[PDB]
Scaffold this active site. Structure first.
Site, mmCIF file in Angstrom:
data_model
loop_
_atom_site.group_PDB
_atom_site.id
_atom_site.type_symbol
_atom_site.label_atom_id
_atom_site.label_comp_id
_atom_site.label_asym_id
_atom_site.label_seq_id
_atom_site.Cartn_x
_atom_site.Cartn_y
_atom_site.Cartn_z
ATOM 1 C CB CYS A 1 -0.801 0.157 1.334
ATOM 2 S SG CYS A 1 -1.749 1.529 1.690
ATOM 3 C CB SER B 1 0.001 3.699 4.256
ATOM 4 O OG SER B 1 -1.070 4.367 3.807
ATOM 5 C CG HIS C 1 2.845 7.664 2.751
ATOM 6 N ND1 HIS C 1 3.283 8.116 1.444
ATOM 7 C CD2 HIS C 1 1.575 7.806 2.629
ATOM 8 C CE1 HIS C 1 1.954 8.644 0.789
ATOM 9 N NE2 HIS C 1 1.227 8.442 1.545
ATOM 10 C CG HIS D 1 -0.820 -1.432 6.446
ATOM 11 N ND1 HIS D 1 0.105 -0.904 5.604
ATOM 12 C CD2 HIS D 1 -1.989 -0.859 6.061
ATOM 13 C CE1 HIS D 1 -0.457 -0.163 4.628
ATOM 14 N NE2 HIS D 1 -1.678 -0.027 4.854
ATOM 15 C CB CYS E 1 -5.152 -1.638 3.571
ATOM 16 S SG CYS E 1 -4.940 0.065 3.543
HETATM 17 N N1 LIG Z 1 -7.400 6.620 5.047
HETATM 18 C C1 LIG Z 1 -6.961 5.496 5.090
HETATM 19 O O1 LIG Z 1 -7.161 4.564 5.951
HETATM 20 C C2 LIG Z 1 -5.719 5.176 4.093
HETATM 21 C C3 LIG Z 1 -5.121 6.047 3.394
HETATM 22 N N2 LIG Z 1 -4.428 5.671 2.320
HETATM 23 C C4 LIG Z 1 -3.556 6.688 1.590
HETATM 24 O O2 LIG Z 1 -4.213 6.974 0.272
HETATM 25 C C5 LIG Z 1 -3.457 7.327 -0.514
HETATM 26 C C6 LIG Z 1 -3.589 6.718 -1.818
HETATM 27 O O3 LIG Z 1 -3.048 5.227 -1.558
HETATM 28 P P1 LIG Z 1 -2.677 4.437 -2.778
HETATM 29 O O4 LIG Z 1 -4.054 4.140 -3.758
HETATM 30 O O5 LIG Z 1 -2.211 3.069 -2.391
HETATM 31 O O6 LIG Z 1 -1.824 5.151 -3.518
HETATM 32 P P2 LIG Z 1 -1.135 5.212 -5.071
HETATM 33 O O7 LIG Z 1 -1.010 3.790 -5.722
HETATM 34 O O8 LIG Z 1 0.091 5.948 -4.959
HETATM 35 O O9 LIG Z 1 -2.180 6.284 -5.694
HETATM 36 C C7 LIG Z 1 -1.993 7.621 -5.826
HETATM 37 C C8 LIG Z 1 -2.413 8.032 -7.242
HETATM 38 O O10 LIG Z 1 -2.420 9.578 -6.944
HETATM 39 C C9 LIG Z 1 -1.793 9.981 -8.280
HETATM 40 N N3 LIG Z 1 -1.318 11.413 -8.107
HETATM 41 C C10 LIG Z 1 -0.193 11.852 -7.404
HETATM 42 N N4 LIG Z 1 0.022 13.134 -7.502
HETATM 43 C C11 LIG Z 1 -1.274 13.566 -8.148
HETATM 44 C C12 LIG Z 1 -1.903 15.001 -8.358
HETATM 45 N N5 LIG Z 1 -1.099 16.090 -8.072
HETATM 46 N N6 LIG Z 1 -2.809 15.033 -8.881
HETATM 47 C C13 LIG Z 1 -3.838 13.905 -9.067
HETATM 48 N N7 LIG Z 1 -3.348 12.635 -8.961
HETATM 49 C C14 LIG Z 1 -2.130 12.510 -8.515
HETATM 50 C C15 LIG Z 1 -0.938 9.024 -8.686
HETATM 51 O O11 LIG Z 1 -0.520 9.261 -10.013
HETATM 52 C C16 LIG Z 1 -1.558 7.863 -8.184
HETATM 53 O O12 LIG Z 1 -2.199 7.029 -9.356
HETATM 54 C C17 LIG Z 1 -2.078 7.496 -0.053
HETATM 55 O O13 LIG Z 1 -1.883 8.876 0.743
HETATM 56 C C18 LIG Z 1 -2.070 6.331 1.028
HETATM 57 O O14 LIG Z 1 -1.386 6.673 2.088
HETATM 58 C C19 LIG Z 1 -4.204 4.238 1.792
HETATM 59 C C20 LIG Z 1 -4.702 3.432 2.532
HETATM 60 C C21 LIG Z 1 -5.375 3.436 4.017
HETATM 61 N N8 LIG Z 1 -4.291 3.493 4.827
HETATM 62 C C22 LIG Z 1 -3.903 4.175 6.285
HETATM 63 C C23 LIG Z 1 -2.830 3.584 6.997
HETATM 64 C C24 LIG Z 1 -2.491 2.475 6.359
HETATM 65 N N9 LIG Z 1 -3.183 2.508 5.026
HETATM 66 ZN ZN LIG Z 2 -3.143 1.124 3.771
#
Ligand SMILES: NC(=O)c1c[n+]([C@@H]2O[C@H](COP(=O)([O-])OP(=O)([O-])OC[C@H]3O[C@@H](n4cnc5c(N)[nH+]cnc54)[C@H](O)[C@@H]3O)[C@@H](O)[C@H]2O)ccc1-n1cccn1
Ligand SMILES: [Zn+2]
Ligand SMILES: NC(=O)c1c[n+]([C@@H]2O[C@H](COP(=O)([O-])OP(=O)([O-])OC[C@H]3O[C@@H](n4cnc5c(N)[nH+]cnc54)[C@H](O)[C@@H]3O)[C@@H](O)[C@H]2O)ccc1-n1cccn1
Ligand SMILES: [Zn+2]
Ligand SMILES: [Zn+2]
Ligand SMILES: [Zn+2]
Lengths: 374, 374
Positions: free
Chosen positions: A46, A48, A51, A67, A174
């Protein structure tokens, strides 16, 4: 025959920020009272977890991250009643103690026993079950799934269907539940509405799934990586926009496209600027915006509170708003009954030993979820 | 007769920011199509009128302010169907056109025809009905009640009970409805809950009335002026706190008092710092905070979005979330049926000619609502 004994096994240890994981031998203590030791079967990557590597999400190092996972109970500590050896389980990064004010509340799910708001990187008792090179290693969110074996508190594990495919249902731990619940539980998307989803990774695709399941008429995906658009449309997006293609700010574009603002918007990236953009693109009198992305540590956003005074609602949530231990088994049962799909999220499969390649795939933009198999 | 003719009458004109109102003769044009000319009977002094004086709330000057009022229809323009000459009416500072997306939405009330978002200070047709010393004078919020006669668009007036006491029900035109609805309609305060109310002026007292009507078990009033506490308790506050009394920030105090955060908080002042404090003092997983205060023009707040990610809801509203033309007559009928009290809000009753004295009472902290009588 490992019950009551230290297990030596491989884990992915993060010794330092901004460095590769080190796959090496760790010692995993036996479970104490109300603890469960789990043999991992599959774990997802994930954002996160990334991160933690980048220092976006601060938690004590050195650490075993991970996780989003599923496994099989190896042994149980004294007093455990909710799982037994040989049960299939999903570790819960948001616990459900069942006793605190949040667990007793009809809506709340961010149990007071969580290790996310002020991370200590320990078990509930303030200690660690992990040693590496003779040194104690921190836990992550009470789960630490990047290890062949982990130990979790009983409030941080759920028993799931014995016939469950673990290499799929780990995503219920998750990314799927977070995004799907953000739509169906936190926003409560309505039939016929217009939704905007910022970020088209695993979590954002799961938000789209939930908006489509709730009957939205329009689901506009927003990403700066246009390679993400095809899969977003497969799971329900009706259109996709890349902010980089426009001269105007994307909130203005989205407001025009929706004839005055969207019903529901979702920030699923983790950037302060897109949290404010997503709020602004919802309709000013009745729009709802949900923050799901994890922001950079300790940083504040800046916004004009007139955005709220006109009537907007702004909220966020962890784990899709789901009470974790009640909901995870039910979500697995619904998956088994074909009520939603997980395969669209899984783009890559690797052995656990190739975890660093899995993170490279995420960072390059190529993957949605990579599932690691032990 | 006056119908069809220009009326010369007395009004309070604001020529410049940060100056007293000038009480002088104005000319009020007869109503055009779909317009209503009203003889004012009573008008309250709301802090938002003072915000025009102070430059906190920007609207074109010179202006006839005033928006919380009641009067009697003197004449109607062509095509008016919802009021007639002789009817008692309350002008609606938030219109209800009935045609826009917001008016058609079950929840929304901030009609797209409002003059609050991007104030022009005119009638709907972009012109003014007021002149003073040969110069055109702006309208305020489509109401302009600091005048013996005003002209409003039909979508900005509601007919009310012919037997209603106008010197009391003028408060339904703003302060009572705004605060009461913030509690009962926007927050949807629940029985047995704990509420915190920041700001104990006319609007905040009305929020307390709503919280009590909704069955809250605890209602904590917060104000830096301890002289406001006695009346807050009379209308339902269970305890009051002055932030100046404490060494720690008041959000910490309120979190401790409520054993981990309040269910519902309300910002009823209009300061950026108290908006963030009010959000922070609600329970992090399921708390709801409502912004009712009007912020200083063009200023942004700074906040950590982890406050939302844990599960808090943040929202704001105009006019208590009430659809104005549907709700005002029902609120007046409810008052006539003794369903709520207005007297606790009224501390002073003055002739209209004493408007400046009424503003001085508000600014000095000595009044809740002054009602001006024509
Ligand atoms: N709230 C929770 O419980 C939670 C939170 N997170 C967080 O969600 C975000 C997304 O996670 P992800 O889908 O696993 O991440 P990516 O695959 O990297 O997708 C992001 C996506 O965004 C695009 N992007 C980047 N920058 C931009 C801008 N400027 N505009 C538009 N789009 C943009 C990328 O190209 C990409 O495709 C993360 O912050 C994550 O930390 C996930 C899960 C759960 N959590 C909480 C604790 C543990 N897990
Ligand atoms: Zn997660
Ligand atoms: N949302 C609406 O539709 C709306 C908004 N307003 C705004 O609400 C605020 C309160 O108005 P009020 O009750 O008329 O004001 P006061 O009588 O001045 O009471 C304020 C109260 O606050 C206390 N206070 C000041 N500073 C502090 C601090 N730092 N801490 C704690 N308390 C503090 C004072 O002592 C006093 O008792 C205003 O912003 C108003 O603009 C009102 C009505 C409607 N609206 C919108 C358009 C027109 N009307
Ligand atoms: Zn709990
Ligand atoms: Zn309208
Ligand atoms: Zn007002």
């Amino acid at each position: 025959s490992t019950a009551g004994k230290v297990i030596k096994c491989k884990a992915a240890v993060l010794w330092e920020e901004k460095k590769p994981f080190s796959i090496e031998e760790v010692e995993v203590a036996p479970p104490k009272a109300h603890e469960v030791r789990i043999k991992m079967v599959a774990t997802g990557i994930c954002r996160s977890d990334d991160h933690v590597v980048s220092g976006t999400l601060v938690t004590p190092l050195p650490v075993i991250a991970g996780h989003e996972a599923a496994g099989i109970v190896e042994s149980i500590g004294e007093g455990v009643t909710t799982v037994r050896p040989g049960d299939k389980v999903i570790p819960l990064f948001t616990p459900q103690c069942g006793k605190c004010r949040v667990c007793k509340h009809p809506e709340g799910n961010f149990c007071l026993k969580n290790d996310l708001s002020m991370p200590r990187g320990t078990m509930q008792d303030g200690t660690s079950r992990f040693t590496c090179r003779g040194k104690p290693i921190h836990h992550f969110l009470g789960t630490s799934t990047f290890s062949q074996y982990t130990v979790v508190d009983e409030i941080s594990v759920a028993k799931i269907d014995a016939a469950s495919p673990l290499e799929k249902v780990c995503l219920i731990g998750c990314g799927f539940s977070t995004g799907y619940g953000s739509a169906v539980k936190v926003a409560k998307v309505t039939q016929g509405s217009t939704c905007a989803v910022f970020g088209l990774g695993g979590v954002g695709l799961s938000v789209i799934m939930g908006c489509k399941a709730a009957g939205a008429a329009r689901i506009i995906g927003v990403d700066i990586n246009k390679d993400k658009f095809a899969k977003a449309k497969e799971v329900g997006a009706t259109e996709c926009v890349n902010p980089q293609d426009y001269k105007k700010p994307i909130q203005e574009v989205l407001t025009e496209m929706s004839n005055g603002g969207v019903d529901f918007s979702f920030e699923v990236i983790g950037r302060l600027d897109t949290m404010v953009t997503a709020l602004s693109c919802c309709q000013e009198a009745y729009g709802v915006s949900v923050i799901t992305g994890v922001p950079p540590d300790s940083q504040n956003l800046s916004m004009n509170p007139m955005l709220l005074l006109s009537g907007r609602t702004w909220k966020g949530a962890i784990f899709g708003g789901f009470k974790s231990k009640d909901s995870v088994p039910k979500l697995v049962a619904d998956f088994m009954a074909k009520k939603f799909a997980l395969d669209p999220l899984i783009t890559h499969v690797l052995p656990f030993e190739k975890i660093n390649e899995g993170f490279d795939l995420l960072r390059s933009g190529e993957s949605i979820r990579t599932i690691l198999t032990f």
